[PDB]
Amino acid sequence: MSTNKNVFFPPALHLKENSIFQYKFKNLAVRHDAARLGIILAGPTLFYWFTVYYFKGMPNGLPPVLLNPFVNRNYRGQKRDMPWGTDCAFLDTKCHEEKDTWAKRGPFFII
Amino acid sequence: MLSRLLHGPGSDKGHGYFHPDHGLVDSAAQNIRGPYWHAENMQFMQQETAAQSSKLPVLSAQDGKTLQKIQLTDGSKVPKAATLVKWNPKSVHQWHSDDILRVDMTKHPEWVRTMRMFHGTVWRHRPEFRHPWFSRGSRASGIIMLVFGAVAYGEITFGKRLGGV
Amino acid sequence: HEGTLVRISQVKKLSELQLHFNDSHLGESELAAKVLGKLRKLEAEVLARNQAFNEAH
Amino acid sequence: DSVHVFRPEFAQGKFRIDLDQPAKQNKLQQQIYTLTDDEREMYEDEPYIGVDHLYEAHKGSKENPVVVEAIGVHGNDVFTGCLGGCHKDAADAVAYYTIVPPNTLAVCIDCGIHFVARINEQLTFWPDGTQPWEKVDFKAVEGFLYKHYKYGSPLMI
Amino acid sequence: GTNPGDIALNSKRFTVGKFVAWACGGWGLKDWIFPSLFIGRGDGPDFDRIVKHTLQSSSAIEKVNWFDSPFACYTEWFVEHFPGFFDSRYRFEMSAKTILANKYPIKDFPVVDMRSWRSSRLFDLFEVPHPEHTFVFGGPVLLNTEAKRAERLEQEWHGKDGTFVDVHPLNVATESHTEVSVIGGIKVYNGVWQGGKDSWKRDSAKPELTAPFHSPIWYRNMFIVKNADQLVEHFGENLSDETWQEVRKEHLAFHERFHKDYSFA
Amino acid sequence: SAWNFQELMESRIPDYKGRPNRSGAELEQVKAALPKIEFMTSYEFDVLTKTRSNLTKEYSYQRDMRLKVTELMLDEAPHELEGLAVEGDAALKQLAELKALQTLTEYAGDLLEGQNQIVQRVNDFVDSNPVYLLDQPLREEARWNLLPEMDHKTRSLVRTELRDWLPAEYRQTRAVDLQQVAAFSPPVKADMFRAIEARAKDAEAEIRSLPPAEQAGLLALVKDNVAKSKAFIDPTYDITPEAINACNDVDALRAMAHRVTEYSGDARLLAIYGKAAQLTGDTAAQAILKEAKDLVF
Amino acid sequence: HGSNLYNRVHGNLPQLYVEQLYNTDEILDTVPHSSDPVHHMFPKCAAASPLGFRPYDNNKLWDAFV
Amino acid sequence: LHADPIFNGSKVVRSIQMMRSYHRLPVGPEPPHLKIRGAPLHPWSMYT
Amino acid sequence: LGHMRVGALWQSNANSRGLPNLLKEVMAAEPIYPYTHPGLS
Ligand SMILES: [Zn+2]
């Protein structure tokens, strides 16, 4: 009477394939999704490493960028107090070590 | 098509909504009358009843005859002695037949979890209360956040950070 | 016996067509005590059911 | 050759109530649409079918009222309404609502229509997986109905 | 209106309530010094008006069953604020009695109360303050769901033929009927049991148990619903329009001596 | 496909098609398969299925409940009317007893209404849960379709099964119409009249075993009851063939024909219309009457 | 509004109100019952208006302060 | 003699106390809004 | 717990006010049988 019967003991269905997988890969949408995956795997990925292998022992001769000149070393006298106290960029780990920046630790809890 | 993009009939305004060819299927029909869009390439199998489970806490609510009428199978390998019954679309009654082989999906973890939510715990109107200690932790966290906010307001305004006293 | 609807074909006097609430005359304290007793019985039954299910499934 | 078992939907409660009787629940939650401006123009010039309307008693007479059914608690007043303009002199801009006692003959003296809003309570088996899979008889149902009438039952909220 | 509660403790010149109202709102020195301007007549029953409306009444005041009704506790409010109350009430009760003394088997009585008013906005149909939970068991049901849909337009929207919408196969079969009768050797098939909508007639009336079977008496309370923004009523079979216009004229002519001595300024 | 805004069930738009296209061979096969059909005027069906006595179209169990409650109320009337004391003359005492009786009947009317409501609630439950009261194959056809949307055969089967699931005292079947069955079966009317006369005689004897004034009052009541019971069973019982033959007024004969047509439309129409045709010389009417008595009656 | 625990326990699915023995607020944390009383928005006004009184009386110090 | 309460029992009264449609404007046979100067104000006016 | 109600019989509340009995409202403290059954005790 309730549908719960088919929830408790659902019917078992017969396939002509060795598994649902194969049977489910006769739909053209799944085939096209697999084709897109294969396109990305075949073209770009195998080519990427190919280039990595082709230029393995050659230099990266791109000229460096020019950020801040010598006459503007003071940044026009602009305040440079980071929220963590010192004057170092967050991920400049080496520069932090020359300004501690981590001796001013707080407490584990409010006190 | 804008209509089809926004889940409408499409170009033909008398058209239906479901396109099971690309995964847009009807869950209600599947649950009630089984996936009749797989009807051409699937067949029911016809010939261990369910009476062995007549004494369990949740299946004891059913009659003995009801469980006797149900025939089970291991659900992995095709029983070589079992005939095949054609699956007929437009027929709402074949999914409910008692002559077809079935599989006991009562040891599935989702089945157990559902029935435990209904038969294995004291009913609470609030799911958060269904877990007692987590609710304790959550109300404690609320009080902790209140205290933290009050202390931070006190410290920032008065200029003393409470660590020296 | 309190499990059935009144069949008019078996009624002998009009007073049998009215529902009877045995506890309609109790005081507040007695009524509260009775309700708490029923709640505790239900709690024991529910705990027994929970044990039986969790042991079997 | 292999055997496949589709994963069933285990959810109970409101979902299983919906999936047990999809016609009634769909009726409850199926949206119906009203006519646009061009459709109103196209409808107002359609013809009557036969000369019956000149002889019969219309739908909404004191002897052939408009009976409608809501769900709720027994004795609770029913919310019903018109979409307006059941009469030439009645407003039609927006729907007009009504609160009426159940199981009583009411008359709208705006349009002149007699209606029978009434309540049917949606008493259903506790959906926890113990619902019956085969035809059930009147005994257990008799007990449950007696208890509901005498004391009441919880709400599925 | 208002219930003054205890008149005694609020008449005192100096009171905690008066001082609090002065501090926060509702009272001030303007009331202590000039009560005749800011208190004046106040709000309460008007004994003189009640006496006037009582003595203007006809002998209907004697013949009305009002003083035994459950609304007898509102006698002064309606005598003061409803000029010609007793004559109108007597006409109302005599109308009910003449409906009761009819020759029809079903006596229909019109009922009008606070629920008899329709509205386009749903929050106007609830009692104030509104209940905590509203529309728990779904929203309104439209009577229009029981009318035949626009079949032609519906077919046309879908691009279906719809040519033969009005041409249907005839059906003459015994399998299509559940209500079978035998009437003088004739087996008549007619109708199908539908359910709750087939028993609207009996569930709406209450019998008089003492009335014989050959002269039944049934009482039915017909509810009335109106918009109150329409200005024209259409009762249907219960009251013809010409009769209603006649009743309007007669009612406005009789209930005029009770209304002519007052101005609306 | 990554979204799914479905609903429980899509709305259903009817397909109309049309009346069947039956060819000549199919037409002859159908016509050779039909019974001896008599096409009936809508007036005939109307009089067959008109509401005459069961004014409120109440089922059997509702009428049984009302009669049972009346019996129970009468069995308790003397106890409620016993010992009443009030200051006043005889008329005041009579009005006091009338008020006591009214209170008694209003008390009993509420219990009956409560029981009617309870049985109606049981039947409402039956409709609300149809799939739980049905066997295969009707269960799925009740699950997927509403009453207006079912096939006629499946609809009838489903409704009959749901009605028969209930105990005999809850099944909703219309009660018999005494006037109808009397109007379409001459013996039944004779039996009903015999029963009325038997009850009248028995009541007259019972009255004659009572003190004087009560005798006169109750005898008047018995006469009125017999007269009105007869007028209830068959309002046209006074239009006898003897009376028809004794009537020589065109207007009176027309009135008789109208009254018979309202009631049952039986061969007494042949008699009345024949006597009207003879008094007026309507040969066309006489020919039509011959045809009618050959075919109609 | 008074509690409805008698009807709830004697009603149709008593197992749903076993939690009421635990730390629970009936108005907020319990399954609603078909026979439960109707809860209004502002109970003070809902109870005072039908009697003709306003919710707060200035004579009472507690009412005035509130 | 008291039977079980029912919503359509004999002892139910018209609900004229609890307001539902507050902002309505009653219609039907109604007097003209005459305005005499110096006369007592009518009960059914906006002035008191 | 206060005054818990006993049973679940109909009570006039906000959601339901019932169907008024106009006949009893009008014919209050007056018999009906002098009109329905004139002349009978
Ligand atoms: Zn209307």
Please report the DSSP string for F187-242 in residue order: HHHHHHHHHHHHHHHHHHHHHHTS-HHHHHHHHHHHHHHHHHHHHHH-TTTT--HH
Resolution value (Å, 1 decimal): 3.1
Nearest to E214 by CA among F53, A13, H15: F53
Question: Residue E76: which region, alpha, beta or left (left: phi > 0; alpha: psi -120 to 50)?
Answer: alpha
- Provide the 3-class DSSP secondary structure of residue D134: coil
Residues ≥6 apart with Cβ < 8 Å to D54: none
Region class of D85: left (phi > 0), else alpha (psi between -120 and 50), else beta: left
Method: cryo-EM
**E-chain residue closest to D32, CA distance:** E145
Q: How far apart are CA F179 and CA F76, in angstroms?
A: 32
Closest CA–CA distance from residue I5 to any residue of chain F (Å): 20
- Tell me the C-alpha to C-alpha distance, in Å, between residue H21 and each of D114, E122, E140, H25: 22, 10, 17, 10
For residue D45, the CA-to-ligand 1 centroid distance in Å is: 21
Amino acid at B10: G
Give yes or no for a contact between E153 and E144, defined as CB atoms under 8 angstroms apart.
Answer: no
Torsion of the alpha carbons at B32, B35, B37 and B42, rounded to the nearest 10: -130
Question: Which residue from G15, G16, G29 is facing B126, i.e. has the nearest CB?
Answer: G29
Q: For B10, which residue in chain E has the nearest alpha carbon?
A: E158
**How many whole angstroms separate alpha carbon E212 and alpha carbon E93?**
26
CA distance G41 to G52: 18
Does the beta carbon of I6 lie under 8 angstroms from any beta carbon of chain H? no
DSSP 3-state of A15: strand
E25: its two tokens: 């709102």
Out of H2, H4, H10, the one facing F109 most closely (by C-beta) is: H10
What is the spatial distance between Cα F184 and Cα F189, in angstroms, rounded to a whole number?
9
Which parts of E101-240 fold into alpha helices (H)?
151-157, 200-203
Tell me how far the alpha carbon of residue D92 lies from the centroid of ligand 1, in angstroms.
Answer: 9
- Which tokens hold the place of D30? 């199926």
Q: Measure CB to CB from residue F113 to each of H1, H2, H6 and give the nearest one.
A: H6
Any B CB within 8 A of D12 CB: yes
Q: How far is CA D10 from CA B28, B103, B111, E97, G16, in A?
A: 13, 15, 6, 63, 21
Query: What would the two tokens of residue F208 be?
Result: 């004659």
Judged by CB atoms closer than 8 Å, whether chains meet at D125 and F167 is answered as: no
Is the separation of the CB atoms in E96 and I23 below 8 Å? yes
CB-based contact F111 C7, cutoff 8 Å: no
Q: Which one-letter DSSP state was computed for residue A100?
A: -
**Which chain E positions have a beta carbon within 8 Å of F117's beta carbon?**
203
Q: How far apart are CA F246 and CA F271, in angstroms?
A: 12
Distance from C-alpha of A50 to C-alpha of F28, rounded to nearest angstrom: 84
Beta bridge partners of D78: D100
Partner C contacted by I5 (CB < 8 A): no
Element (H, E) at E210: none
**H25 in Cβ contact with E229 (< 8 Å):** yes
The reply to whether residue G52 touches residue E17, judged by beta carbons under 8 angstroms, is no
CA nearest E128 in I: which residue? I14
DSSP-derived secondary structure letter, E67? G
Strand-pairing partners, residue B100, are B46
I16 at the G interface (CB within 8 A)? no
Q: Choose from H14, H18, H19 for mutation: most chain I CBs within 10 A.
A: H14
Evaluate whether I36 touches E216 at the Cβ level (below 8 Å).
no
**CB within 8 A of D1, min separation 6: which ones?**
A14, A15, A16, A17, A18, B78
Contact (CB<8Å) I17/D101: yes
> Cα D34–D36–D38 angle (5° rounding)?
140
Neighbors of chain B by Cβ distance (3+ pairs < 8 Å)? A, C, D, E, F, G
Query: Which residues of G have a CB under 8 Å from any CB of I?
Result: 2-7, 11, 34-35, 37-38, 40
Distance of CA F275 to the CA centre of its chain: 33
Beta bridge partners of B84: B45
CB F92 within 8 A of CB F99: no
Across the interface, do E260 and H34 touch by the CB < 8 Å criterion?
Answer: yes
Q: Does I10 contact H11 at a Cβ distance shorter than 8 Å?
A: no
Q: How far is F72 from chain C (nearest CA, A)?
A: 6
Q: How far is the CA of F17 from the centre of ligand 1 (A)?
A: 34
What's the sign of the alpha-carbon dihedral F73, F76, F78, F79? negative
Residue type, E107: K
The B-side interface with A (CB below 8 A) comprises 21-23, 31-32, 34, 38, 41-45, 50, 59, 70, 72-73, 75, 78, 84, 87, 95-96, 100-106, 111, 147-148, 151, 162-163
For chain I, which chains pass the contact test of at least 3 CB pairs under 8 Å? C, D, E, F, G, H
The answer to whether residues A4 and D133 touch, using CB atoms and an 8 Å cutoff, is: yes
Q: Which residues of I touch D74 (CB under 8 A)?
A: 10
Six-digit token string for E203: 């569930």
Tally of CB atoms within 10 A around F159: 22
Contact E164, F17 (CB under 8 A): yes
Crossing angle (nearest 10°) for helices F283-295 and F268-280: 160
DSSP string, B31-81: HHH--GGG-SS-EEEE--BSGGGTTSTTGGGS-HHHHHT-EE--SSS--TT
| Placement of tokens 């020759």 in the chain | E103
Which chains would you list as touching A if contact means 3+ CB atom pairs under 8 Å?
B, D, F
Q: Which chains touch D (3 or more CB pairs under 8 A)?
A: A, B, C, E, F, G, H, I
F229: tokens are: 């019971």
- Asked whether E120 and D53 are in contact (CB, 8 A), the reply is no
Amino acid at F266: D
Could you give phi then psi for residue D100, rounded to 5 degrees?
-135, 145
**Inter-chain CB pairs, D–I, below 8 Å:** 21
Query: Within its chain, how far is the Cα of F34 from the centroid?
Result: 32
Q: Do F110 and H10 touch (CB under 8 A)?
A: yes
How far from G26 is each of B132, E64, G22, G30, I9, CA to CA, in Å? Answer: 18, 49, 11, 5, 21
Is B42 an 8 Å CB contact of chain D? Answer: yes
For residues H29 and A3, what is the distance between their CA atoms, to the nearest angstrom?
61
Cα of H1 to nearest chain C Cα, Å: 9
- Tell me the C-alpha distance between D88 and D112, whole Å: 11
3-state secondary structure of A23: helix
Contact C5 D146 (CB under 8 A): yes
- Residues 6+ positions from F144 with CB-CB distance below 8 Å: B92, D22, D23
What's the CA gap between D156 and D14, in Å, rounded?
8
Contact present, I and B (at least 3 Cβ pairs less than 8 Å): no
> Which residues of chain A form beta strands (DSSP E)?
13-15
Per CB distance under 8 Å, which residues of H are interface residues toward C? Answer: 3-4
Cβ neighbors of E180 (< 8 A, separation 6 or more) are: E187, E188, E189
Which of C23, C35, C42 is the closest to G18 by Cβ?
C42
